[PDB]
Design a protein around this ligand. Structure first.
Ligand SMILES: CCCCCCCCCCCCCC(=O)CSCCNC(=O)CCNC(=O)[C@H](O)C(C)(C)COP(=O)(O)OP(=O)(O)OC[C@H]1O[C@@H](n2cnc3c(N)ncnc32)[C@H](O)[C@@H]1OP(=O)(O)O
Ligand SMILES: [Mg+2]
Length: 388
């Protein structure tokens, strides 16, 4: 509530990362690669065990789903919780280069109840002039009952171990809370697509005084998209999408570098997981693409609705079409698919449209972090990486 004090990074102090608020003017690995690496798993509190989850096993996925449905990311006010679908999880956790030893679970020794999880997946990552093989870390989760018993540092050490085994010594990760040390701090913005449901669910916030009718009328969108050539992406586009994305991403201080197998993984439309629309220039050649992913949230304690449907801006590449025109079509497309809210961070060039497409700013930050790499902290606008 009010209770301002000062934190000691019991776990994070010990780790290869910069001290919170050291001034960094250098570029490089905080420590060199471990040429000899620990081969035995870290010790768990008694009653608990390591499991490598096989998500191909329908019952295991279902357990993982239920763990996260019930114990994953919640907002400040705790009226909302991420409801990552089982298939969304299959998409996010099994890109090209994925290894199963990187799907790390914690289970109750006796009744086998899944109570912990952390995941890693491979990616080539460009920090300023250095493109490094890293992993992206996601889905850290400890069961509500098990909170505050130092289990999160066990999973983090353990995943640090199984990744190090494989010759990776750098990683990237985001979190909504401050740790040592943010490269950058982004802010979520939200765009009402359906302001009535947003109001009844209490997600917004009618700006007193404002009628409902006037709100609905402000966020009014057309029913049909504007850009000539605009259509879903199909397999034949894979090659041109790659080229377009690796070129566009050059301008940003942080960005992945993707091959084609990765391009097909991340961008080919999958219903209720990922949408990608390409702009085909008047002949046949591709000049732009917008994309966005599907992530509903559980509305906790409410009578009317139990789920809020959100679109997350992913990567939007513009060469011919202006960006604000692309994003206007992204909004229209999301609206017409029954989403209630379009969400975007203020990274890349997104600041160039947020205010103009009537996004409003939202609570809390998203910090971006690197593991075992020092570099100065750049602005949101210079961040060209997006994680699920
Ligand atoms: C080269 C490969 C490298 C691989 C790994 C690289 C790094 C990967 C790092 C992972 C990146 C994940 C990316 C990602 O998944 C995206 S951010 C999503 C994180 N998950 C959630 O918010 C789920 C809801 N919360 C929880 O489940 C728990 O509260 C968690 C699991 C967060 C901690 O459960 P707990 O019961 O509340 O905590 P204790 O067991 O008592 O442990 C407390 C220690 O945990 C530190 N902590 C708290 N939140 C953290 C966070 N979000 N990152 C890192 N550390 C975090 C905390 O500062 C303290 O350390 P300190 O004493 O030093 O201050
Ligand atoms: Mg704990």
């Amino acid at each position: 509530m009010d209770e301002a004090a000062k934190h000691r990074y019991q776990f994070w102090d010990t780790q290869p990362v910069p001290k919170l608020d050291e001034v960094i003017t250098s570029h490089g690995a905080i420590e060199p690669d471990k040429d000899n690496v620990r081969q035995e798993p870290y010790s768990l509190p008694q009653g608990f065990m390591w499991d490598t989850l096989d998500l191909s096993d329908a019952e295991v996925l279902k357990e993982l789903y239920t763990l996260l449905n019930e114990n994953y990311v919640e907002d400040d006010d705790n009226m909302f919780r991420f409801d990552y679908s089982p298939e969304f999880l299959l998409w996010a956790l099994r890109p090209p280069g994925w290894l199963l030893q990187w799907h790390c679970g914690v289970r109750v020794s006796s009744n086998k109840k899944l109570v912990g999880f952390i995941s890693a997946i491979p990616a080539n990552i460009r920090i300023y002039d250095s493109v490094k093989k890293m992993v992206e870390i996601n889905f850290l989760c400890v069961h509500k009952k098990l909170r505050s018993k130092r289990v999160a540092p066990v999973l983090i050490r353990e995943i640090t171990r199984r990744v190090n085994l494989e010759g990776i010594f750098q990683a990237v990760y985001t979190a909504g809370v401050v740790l040592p040390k943010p490269i950058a701090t982004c802010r979520y913005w939200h765009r009402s697509l359906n302001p009535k449901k947003l109001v009844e669910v209490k997600f917004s916030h009618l700006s007193r005084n404002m009628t409902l009718q006037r709100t609905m009328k402000l966020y009014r969108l057309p029913d049909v998209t504007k850009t000539s050539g605009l259509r879903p992406m199909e397999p034949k586009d894979i090659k041109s999408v790659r080229e377009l994305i690796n070129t566009y991403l050059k301008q940003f201080h942080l960005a992945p570098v993707m091959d084609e197998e990765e391009v097909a993984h991340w961008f080919l439309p999958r219903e209720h997981i990922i949408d990608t629309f390409v702009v085909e220039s008047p002949n046949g050649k591709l000049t732009d693409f917008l994309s966005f992913y599907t992530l509903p949230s559980t509305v906790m304690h409410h009578p009317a609705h139990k789920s809020l449907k959100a679109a997350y801006s992913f990567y939007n590449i513009h060469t011919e079409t202006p960006l604000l025109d692309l994003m206007s079509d992204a909004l229209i497309l999301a609206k017409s698919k029954g989403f209630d809210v379009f969400n975007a961070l203020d990274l890349m060039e997104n600041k160039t449209f947020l205010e103009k497409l009537k996004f409003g700013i939202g609570d809390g930050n998203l910090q971006y972090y690197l593991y075992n790499w020092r570099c100065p902290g750049t602005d949101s606008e210079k961040v060209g990486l997006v994680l699920q």
